[PDB]
Design a protein around this ligand. Structure first.
Ligand code: NA
Ligand code: NA
Ligand code: NA
Length: 459
């Protein structure tokens, strides 16, 4: 009733999105309403090549800094003990792709700005369940920009850094694997609720000024209609705001901002992550059935290929590169087409209906393309469904060994796997499918000896 809310903005502007993220910070300063129940602490890492702005944060710089944002104001902070490399006069360059930096940021905010509710907004690029936050200041073992892999974040972060809400201001983050990775009760770092978009997010990103202009005490409303909650858009007191109200804020303001500019391809969803497991298990059941009834042909006919797909998806199907990297399809649409197709038995239909029920329970709010018959609260979550047999000649599935449960670098594959979505629910028996990962591996890996085929996993 008199809670305090700390919002931690992990701003990785060390890339081409620097100007957009500086505009986002300006929007935060504009919309932020000063209150003793609210804190906005931002770890901003800028770039030395793109934007040369000096009006948002007071000067032009290229290092990593800690700021506290208030109305029309951003005061630079000291790193103190949790981040001793950062001071009010330091010139420290951080690697935002290093999960230890994110860990130090979360610990700093929890130590110096204690609160009853924690929100974590991670802002950068995004690439599904593989990664997030690419940093141009540090190069990996391939000469590319270092990034945060989901399994890497789980490996380095513990339960001490768990948050109440996790917002991904990045592309292609609303996947079932991502939501399951950070579910509460996984033993380590987790988020009670997740805000994410299944497809790419447009340039402007989130309309933070409107969001923070609605995080205000005193009650009241504006004249704008609320299409997620019904009625008029309400103001939510920081002393009493809940996870659901903040998520509805994100979803509704993104809907209004995107549709105002005629961008009906944009999406955003709010998930209760304590339902994530309930969805995963559900899909897993379906997966087992899909293995036992030899339905690879029918699922491939539902998914499609090339530019001819009828499943609701969140990538540019005209780009084979996106087919290889982000073949993410809507889970609810897949289960609905299974349940309504005449190429599936009654058992498969019932398992798909159970998956739909769990999905409806998980996805609290969502908005999408109305021309695609988007079902709010049902559509809005994606799942990895590759064209594993299509050759590029190299098959797609061999280029997707990152979608794995193992330590891929330890087995010579491309950086990082360790996705709990792929690990949990595996059937230890050989030639036996236990979960979605093993189903895909059984469908697309042509050899299954002890060496584990192309992804070094024996299903
Ligand atoms: Na950096
Ligand atoms: Na509205
Ligand atoms: Na394999």
């Amino acid at each position: 009733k008199n809670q305090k809310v700390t919002i931690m903005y992990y701003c990785d502007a060390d890339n081409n999105l620097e100007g957009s993220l500086l505009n986002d910070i300006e929007e935060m300063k504009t919309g932020y309403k000063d209150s003793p129940n609210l804190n906005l602490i931002a770890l901003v890492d800028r770039s030395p090549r793109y934007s040369s702005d000096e009006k948002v944060l007071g000067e032009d710089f290229s290092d990593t800094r800690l700021y506290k944002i208030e109305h029309n104001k951003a005061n630079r902070l000291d790193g103190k003990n949790e981040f001793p490399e950062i001071s009010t006069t330091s010139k420290y360059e951080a690697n935002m792709g290093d999960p230890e930096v994110l860990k130090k940021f979360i610990d700093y905010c929890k130590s110096n700005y204690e609160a009853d509710k924690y929100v974590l907004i991670m802002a950068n690029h995004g690439g599904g369940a593989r990664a997030i936050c690419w940093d141009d200041s540090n190069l990996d073992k391939n000469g590319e920009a270092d990034c945060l892999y989901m399994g890497e974040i789980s490996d380095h972060l513990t339960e001490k850094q768990s948050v109440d809400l996790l917002a991904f201001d990045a592309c292609l983050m609303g996947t079932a694997e991502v939501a399951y990775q950070y579910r509460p009760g996984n033993g380590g770092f987790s988020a009670d609720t997740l805000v994410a978009s299944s497809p790419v997010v447009w340039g402007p990103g989130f309309k933070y000024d409107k969001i923070f202009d609605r995080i205000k005490a005193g009650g009241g409303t504006n004249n704008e209609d609320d299409l997620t909650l019904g009625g008029k858009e309400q103001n939510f007191d920081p002393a009493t705001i809940t996870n659901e109200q903040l998520g509805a804020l994100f979803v509704e303001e993104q809907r209004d901002s995107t549709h105002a500019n005629g961008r009906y391809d944009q999406h955003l969803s709010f998930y209760d992550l304590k339902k994530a497991e309930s969805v995963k298990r559900a899909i897993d059941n379906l997966a087992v059935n899909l293995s036992n009834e030899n339905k690879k042909s029918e699922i491939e006919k539902l998914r499609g290929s090339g530019i001819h797909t009828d499943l609701m998806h969140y990538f540019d199907e005209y780009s084979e590169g996106e087919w290889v990297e982000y073949p993410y399809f809507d889970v609810y649409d897949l289960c609905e087409k299974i349940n309504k197709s005449e190429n599936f038995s009654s058992k498969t239909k019932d398992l798909a209906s159970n998956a739909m029920n769990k999905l409806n329970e998980m996805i609290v709010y969502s908005f999408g393309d109305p021309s695609n018959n988007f079902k709010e609260g049902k559509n809005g979550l994606s799942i990895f469904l590759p064209n594993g047999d299509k050759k590029y000649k190299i098959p797609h599935w061999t280029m997707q060994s990152w979608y794995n449960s193992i330590d891929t670098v330890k087995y010579g594959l491309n950086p990082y796997g360790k996705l709990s979505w792929c690990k949990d629910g595996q059937d230890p028996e050989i030639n036996k499918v236990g979960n979605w990962f093993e189903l895909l591996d059984s469908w697309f890996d042509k050899t299954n000896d002890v060496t584990g085929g192309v992804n070094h996993y024996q299903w």
